[PDB]
Every structure is written in C-alpha cells, then in structure tokens.
Amino acid sequence: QTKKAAIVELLKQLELGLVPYDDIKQLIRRELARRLQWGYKPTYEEQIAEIQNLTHSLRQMKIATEVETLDSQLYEIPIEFLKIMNGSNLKGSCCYFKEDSTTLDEAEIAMLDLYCERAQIQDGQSVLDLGCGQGALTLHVAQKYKNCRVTAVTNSVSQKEYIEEESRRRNLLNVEVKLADITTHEMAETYDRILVIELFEHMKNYELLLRKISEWISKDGLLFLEHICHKTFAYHYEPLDDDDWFTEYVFPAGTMIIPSASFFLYFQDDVSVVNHWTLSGKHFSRTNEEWLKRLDANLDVIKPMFETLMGNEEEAVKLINYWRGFCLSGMEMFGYNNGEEWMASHVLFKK
Amino acid sequence: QTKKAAIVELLKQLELGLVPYDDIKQLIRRELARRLQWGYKPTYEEQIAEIQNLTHSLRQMKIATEVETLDSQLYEIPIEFLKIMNGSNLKGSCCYFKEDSTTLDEAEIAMLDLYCERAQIQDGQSVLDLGCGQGALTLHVAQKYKNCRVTAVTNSVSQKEYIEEESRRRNLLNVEVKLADITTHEMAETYDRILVIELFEHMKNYELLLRKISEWISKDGLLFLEHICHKTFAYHYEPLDDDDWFTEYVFPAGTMIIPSASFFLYFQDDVSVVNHWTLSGKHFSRTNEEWLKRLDANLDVIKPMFETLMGNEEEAVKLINYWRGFCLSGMEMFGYNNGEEWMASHVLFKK
Numbered sequence: 001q002t003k004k005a006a007i008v009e010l011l012k013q014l015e016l017g018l019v020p021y022d023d024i025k026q027l028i029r030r031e032l033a034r035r036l037q038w039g040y041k042p043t044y045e046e047q048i049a050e051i052q053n054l055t056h057s058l059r060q061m062k063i064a065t066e067v068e069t070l071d072s073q074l075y076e077i078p079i080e081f082l083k084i085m086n087g088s089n090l091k092g093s094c095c096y097f098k099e100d101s102t103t104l105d106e107a108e109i110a111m112l113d114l115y116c117e118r119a120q121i122q123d124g125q126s127v128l129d130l131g132c133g134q135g136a137l138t139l140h141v142a143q144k145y146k147n148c149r150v151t152a153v154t155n156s157v158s159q160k161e162y163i164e165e166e167s168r169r170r171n172l173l174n175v176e177v178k179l180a181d182i183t184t185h186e187m188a189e190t191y192d193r194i195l196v197i198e199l200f201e202h203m204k205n206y207e208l209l210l211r212k213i214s215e216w217i218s219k220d221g222l223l224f225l226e227h228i229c230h231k232t233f234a235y236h237y238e239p240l241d242d243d244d245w246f247t248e249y250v251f252p253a254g255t256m257i258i259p260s261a262s263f264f265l266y267f268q269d270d271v272s273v274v275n276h277w278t279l280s281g282k283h284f285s286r287t288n289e290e291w292l293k294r295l296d297a298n299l300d301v302i303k304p305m306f307e308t309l310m311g312n313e314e315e316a317v318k319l320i321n322y323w324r325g326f327c328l329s330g331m332e333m334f335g336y337n338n339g340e341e342w343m344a345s346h347v348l349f350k351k
Numbered sequence: 352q353t354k355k356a357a358i359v360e361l362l363k364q365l366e367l368g369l370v371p372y373d374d375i376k377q378l379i380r381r382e383l384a385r386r387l388q389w390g391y392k393p394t395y396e397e398q399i400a401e402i403q404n405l406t407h408s409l410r411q412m413k414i415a416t417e418v419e420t421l422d423s424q425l426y427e428i429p430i431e432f433l434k435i436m437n438g439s440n441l442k443g444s445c446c447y448f449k450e451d452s453t454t455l456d457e458a459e460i461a462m463l464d465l466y467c468e469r470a471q472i473q474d475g476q477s478v479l480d481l482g483c484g485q486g487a488l489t490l491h492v493a494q495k496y497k498n499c500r501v502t503a504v505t506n507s508v509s510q511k512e513y514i515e516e517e518s519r520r521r522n523l524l525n526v527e528v529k530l531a532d533i534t535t536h537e538m539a540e541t542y543d544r545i546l547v548i549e550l551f552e553h554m555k556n557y558e559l560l561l562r563k564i565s566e567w568i569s570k571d572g573l574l575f576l577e578h579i580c581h582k583t584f585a586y587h588y589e590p591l592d593d594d595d596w597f598t599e600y601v602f603p604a605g606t607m608i609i610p611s612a613s614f615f616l617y618f619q620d621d622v623s624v625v626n627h628w629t630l631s632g633k634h635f636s637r638t639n640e641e642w643l644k645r646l647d648a649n650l651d652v653i654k655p656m657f658e659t660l661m662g663n664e665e666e667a668v669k670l671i672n673y674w675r676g677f678c679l680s681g682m683e684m685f686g687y688n689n690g691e692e693w694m695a696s697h698v699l700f701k702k
C-alpha cells in the first residue's frame with residue numbers, strides 16, 4: 001500500500017539528488033539480487049525452457065515497437081553534453097579496460113580495435129554500421145582503413161549530422177551516413193561487413209531483423225554483433241513487481257531487452273555463427289564509472305547547459321540526476337558479482 | 352520522390368561551384384562504386400554474354416549518332432583556353448607519367464613517343480591521324496620525321512585552325528589537314544599508318560567504321576588505336592538509374608561509350624590484331640589532375656576569357672565549373688582502385 005508510495009518517494013529523492021551515491025548503489029544491488037533470484041531456476045530444464053519461451057514469443061512480434069518514443073527520451077542528446085560525459089570518440093557503448101591504468105579514451109580505442117580484429121575488417125572492404133551512434137566506430141574504421149567505404153545508419157537527425165561534419169573535419173571521404181529507421185528500412189545495396197553495436201537490445205523480433213540484415217551481406221561477408229547480456233537467463237526489462245523501481249529507473253518501459261549470452265544462437269535461420277566471445281561486465285562497469293566522474297567533474301559547465309536546454313533549474317536537476325542514475329545503473333549492474341553476472345557478448349555471423 | 356529533387360539541387364551547386372572538391376570526389380566514388388556493382392557479373396558466362404549483347408547491338412546502329420551536336424557542346428573550344436589547361440602540345444587525351452615527378456609536358460611527350468613506337472612509325476611513311484584534336488600527335492610525328500607526310504582529319508573548324516598556322520609557325524612541310532565528318536567521309540587515298548586516339552568512344556557501329564578505315568590502309572600498313580576503357584565490361588554511357596547524376600555530368604547524352612579492354616578484338620572482320628597493350632588508369636588520372644591544377648592556377652586569366660566568350664558572369668561561372676567537373680570525373684574514374692578498373696587500351700591492327 002504505502003511502500004508503493006515509499007517507492008514514489010525514493011524516485012523523488014533521486015530526482016532531487018537527495019540520496020548519496022553509496023546509498024543508491026546499495027539500493028540498486030538489492031534490486032539486482034532480486035532480479036537474479038527471479039532469473040535463475042532450480043533445475044536446468046526450466047532454465048532452458050525460459051529461454052525458449054522468450055525466443056518463441058519474440059518471433060510473433062514486430063521488429064520493434066518503441067520506435068519513435070525511441071530516442072526522443074534518449075539518443076537525441078545534444079552533442080555538446082556527450083563530449084563532456086563520453087570520451088574523445090563519443091562511444092555510447094561498452095569500452096575495454098585491459099589494465100587498472102587504462103583511461104576512458106584508451107578504453108574506447110581498445111574496443112574499437114577489438115571490433116576490427118574480431119570482425120576481420122580489411123583495407124578494401126565496404127563496412128556497414130547499423131546504429132552508429134555518434135560514429136565512434138565509423139570514424140575509427142574510416143581513418144584506419146582509407147580504402148574502406150564505411151556507411152553509417154541512424155534514425156537520429158543529430159547523430160547523422162555530427163558524423164558528417166566531424167568526418168569532413170577529420171579529412172575523411174569514405175564516411176557516408178543515411179537517415180532511416182532500420183525497423184522499416186529496405187535497401188538494394190550490399191556490404192562486405194556489417195557492424196551492429198548494442199542495437200538489438202532495442203529490437204523485438206530478431207528473426208525478421210536478422211533476415212533483413214542477412215540480405216544486406218555480401219557473399220563471403222561477415223556480420224559482427226555486440227550486445228550486453230546476462231550469462232544465463234534473458235528477459236524483457238519490465239518491473240519484477242510492486243517493489244521493482246530499478247528496471248524503469250533509466251530506460252522507458254518496453255524499450256529494452258536483456259538477452260542471455262547464448263540468445264542469438266537460437267536465431268540462425270539466415271545467418272550462421274562462426275565465432276562467439278563473451279566479455280567481463282567490469283569493462284562496462286568501469287565505462288559508466290568514468291562517465292560518472294566526468295559529469296561531477298564538469299557540473300560547472302553541465303548545469304548551465306541543462307538550464308538552457310530546459311526552461312528551469314528544477315528540471316535541470318532532474319536531468320543531471322537522471323544521467324547519474326544512468327551511470328550508477330551501469331556501474332552496479334555490470335560490476336555485480338565481479339562482473340560475472342551481467343556482461344557483454346560478441347557474435348560473428350556469416351551468410 | 353525527394354531524391355530526384357535532391358539531385359537537381361546538387362547539380363546546381365556544382366554549377367555555381369558551391370561544393371568543395373572533396374565532397375565532389377566523394378560523391379563521384381559512390382557512383383563509381385555503383386557502376387562497378389552494375390558492371391561486374393556473378394558468373395563469367397553472363398559477363399561474356401554482356402559483351403556479346405553490346406557488340407551485336409552496335410552492328411545494327413549507324414557509325415555515329417549526335418555527330419555535330421557533339422561538335423557543338425564539345426571539341427569546338429577556344430584555342431586560348433586549351434593552352435592554359437592543356438600542355439605544350441595541347442594533348443586532349445591520356446598522358447604518360449613514368450615516375451612521380453613527371454610534369455604534364457613531359458607526360459604529353461611520353462605518350463606521343465610511345466605512339467610512334469607501338470605504331471612503328473618510320474621516317475619514310477604516310478601517316479593519317481583520325482580525330483587529331485589540336486594536332487598534338489600530328490605536329491609531333493611531323494617534325495622529326497621530316498620525310499613523313501602527316502594528314503590530320505577533323506570535323507572541328509576550330510581544330511583545323513590551330514594546326515595549320517602552328518604547323519608553318521614551326522616551319523613544317525609534312526602537315527596537311529582535312530575538314531570532314533569521319534562518319535560520312537569517303538576518300539580514294541591510302542596511308543602507310545593510320546592513328547586513332549580516343550575517337551571510337553563517340554562512335555557506335557564499329558564494324559562499319561573499321562571497314563571504312565581499313566580501306567584507307569596501304570597493304571603492309573598498320574592501324575594503331577587508343578581507347579579508354581574498363582578492363583572487364585563495356586557499356587553505353589547512359590545513367591544507371593535516376594539517382595545516377597555522374598554519367599551525364601560531363602558528356603552530353605548518347606555521345607559516349609565505355610568499351611571493354613577486349614572489345615575491339617570482336618571487330619576483326621576487315622582488320623586483324625597484331626599486338627595488344629593496356630595502361631594503368633593512374634596515367635589519365637594524373638593527366639586530368641594536372642589539367643585541374645592549371646585551371647585554378649590561372650583563374651585570373653581564364654575567368655575574363657569566359658566572360659568574353661559568354662555574355663554574363665553567371666554562365667562564365669557555370670563553364671569553369673564544368674571543366675572542373677570534367678577533370679574531377681577524369682581523376683576519380685581512372686584513378687579508382689589504384690587505376691586498375693577504368694584504364695587505357697592500345698591495339699595494333701594490320702589489314
């Protein structure tokens with residue numbers, strides 16, 4: 001009764017930044033632990049059954065609902081704010097920290113290099129970057145492979161822009177950006193290597209999506225895929241119950257899906273898995289931590305920025321405290337259990 | 352829908368010189384890449400079948416179409432403009448760059464020397480130069496082959512000009528020039544060596560043309576031909592689709608043909624191939640590059656020249672940017688993939 005009110009009192013305290021970081025982390029692990037209790041099953045038969053029920057149900061849905069409440073709540077973020085929170089490459093995804101001494105910028109370059117290595121991109125190929133974001137991978141591949149023909153795809157208007165100027169500003173011609181919704185977009189072109197970095201989490205019907213992406217692959221071409229995940233169970237990001245405030249704490253309802261590490265192994269109707277890697281949840285946990293440090297370290301420039309974009313300081317506070325919850329959610333979630341619960345997954349496909 | 356209108360806007364920007372060189376080359380490579388995908392075939396059978404479709408279709412057309420409307424939009428250029436863009440010999444065709452420090456003038460001489468070598472021109476012979484242009488080849492062969500008797504043929508009153516005066520301005524006997532349309536011209540004289548440098552690209556029925564040219568060959572005489580090409584497929588210079596702006600960007604519609612390197616091996620009804628060479632596309636690429644440099648470097652003299660030729664500044668701007676797009680298309684097309692796609696071909700025929 002009143003602990004639903006207690007829940008709607010916690011969220012207000014978080015919106016007003018009244019709750020210390022440690023207390024936030026503590027409350028998060030509680031909901032994380034409750035998630036694991038909900039996810040894990042007593043027998044392995046039930047565990048595999050749960051993965052089957054989810055894979056079968058998604059094949060009845062559309063490629064994606066959520067599609068234009070999409071990135072108005074998210075991804076349509078002003079570029080001037082991302083250059084403060086993110087690294088030099090503006091990578092809005094997981095970064096790779098090999099040593100404790102690894103900076104955010106170094107971590108960004110690490111993942112990008114590992115992408116080219118596991119996707120096996122060579123100097124004379126045509127590359128496709130679905131959900132390119134701010135073009136962290138596009139600009140990186142374009143410069144490192146002068147004879148490549150990278151093509152970035154986005155449904156975001158300001159994401160399509162920053163790439164097109166920063167590509168020309170960096171002396172790059174290989175770069176090409178298209179404005180389209182991958183859910184309903186069709187193209188008669190074909191590429192040697194298709195790169196998808198944390199895009200499927202937003203989709204639903206993976207059979208239809210992979211069927212569409214498969215047709216864009218050149219023969220002897222390869223499809224590389226990264227997606228954050230749990231190592232065992234998968235599930236829609238819908239609240240566990242009355243007390244679950246953490247699920248919809250950052251991402252809007254019905255916009256997220258957390259696959260198991262073996263999830264896309266059950267979607268090989270048009271593609272065939274060649275190689276499969278996982279990656280410690282620490283890498284993303286540290287990534288959000290470095291993002292969090294840059295927010296607090298630059299509140300002097302971020303605050304007036306949010307005041308200008310908003311209309312009042314009140315909602316300028318709710319916004320800065322949202323991006324804190326964003327970083328904090330990523331920190332404690334992927335760093336949970338020594339980063340051996342929620343983590344990243346790399347899959348390499350062929351035609 | 353809006354992609355058709357997006358193209359006409361681009362063409363207008365190019366006319367008014369509002370698009371930087373790098374975005375132009377980038378947009379060209381995209382179309383170039385699109386033509387390669389359209390040209391290359393998955394099976395060699397279909398690749399050979401395409402060559403046969405074009406070779407057979409040409410044997411029904413007339414020798415040439417759009418004959419004097421090709422003489423109007425092009426090849427009737429004021430001589431004082433060519434002196435600035437072209438080299439010393441005014442060679443309106445591919446030049447030969449042996450090493451990186453080769454000048455334009457050196458390149459013009461390099462090709463001309465290579466012509467006499469592969470044509471095996473010797474002092475006491477009668478030479479015919481079909482499509483002489485500004486007589487870069489005629490004057491060259493005429494000078495230090497004093498006992499030769501060069502004869503230039505042109506349908507351009509402007510080209511029949513410069514040669515004659517600049518032939519006795521250098522004190523030359525051999526040079527003799529004719530004004531006629533090769534498409535319809537008959538002649539009862541016969542030569543020891545006929546030289547055709549990039550003329551067949553404007554023609555259609557090669558069987559009828561080579562049948563006529565062969566009649567002008569003295570027995571034990573030779574026919575040397577140079578033609579730009581692609582190493583594999585051939586095609587009319589017509590738009591791929593409505594999104595293909597590059598095809599009719601430089602040359603007027605229906606006035607161009609891009610032969611295969613092996614194309615004129617299929618037209619040996621009256622002539623017989625003796626030798627066959629190709630030549631890297633980097634040669635003509637650098638050639639158009641040197642031409643482009645000479646344009647921008649002499650805009651202080653070129654502009655007032657175009658203002659005088661035209662009637663207003665608006666059309667003067669359109670014209671200079673045309674020759675810019677002329678050289679830009681030449682650079683990227685022949686320089687594409689290290690010049691191993693579109694290139695030049697040399698063929699030596701006997702009767």
Ligand SMILES: Nc1ncnc2c1ncn2[C@@H]1O[C@H](CSCC[C@H](N)C(=O)O)[C@@H](O)[C@H]1O
Pocket residue numbers: 064067070071075090091092093130131132133134135136153154155156159180181182183197198199202
């Ligand atoms: N329905 C949709 N259609 C096209 N792009 C979408 C999409 N839904 C999400 N995206 C894009 O996919 C990206 C996922 S976030 C990943 C960004 C980028 N790949 C990086 O690593 O930095 C977002 O930038 C968003 O713009």
Ligand SMILES: Nc1ncnc2c1ncn2[C@@H]1O[C@H](CSCC[C@H](N)C(=O)O)[C@@H](O)[C@H]1O
Pocket residue numbers: 415418421426441442443444445481482483484485486487504505506507510531532533534548549550553
């Ligand atoms: N139908 C036609 N009849 C006679 N000459 C033609 C012709 N169509 C094109 N030409 C000539 O062929 C030339 C092709 S451009 C090549 C010019 C010269 N051979 C050089 O290498 O520099 C043009 O100068 C043009 O005047």
Ligand SMILES: COc1cc2c(cc1OC)CC(=O)NC2
Pocket residue numbers: 092093198199201202228250326329330
């Ligand atoms: C809140 O941490 C997350 C960050 C990101 C994703 C998921 C996150 O939490 C599960 C996936 C994504 O599309 N972008 C980055």
Ligand SMILES: COc1cc2c(cc1OC)CC(=O)NC2
Pocket residue numbers: 443444549550552553579601677678680681
């Ligand atoms: C635009 O580059 C070209 C230049 C020339 C030709 C073709 C070109 O492009 C294919 C052939 C010709 O008759 N004259 C020169």
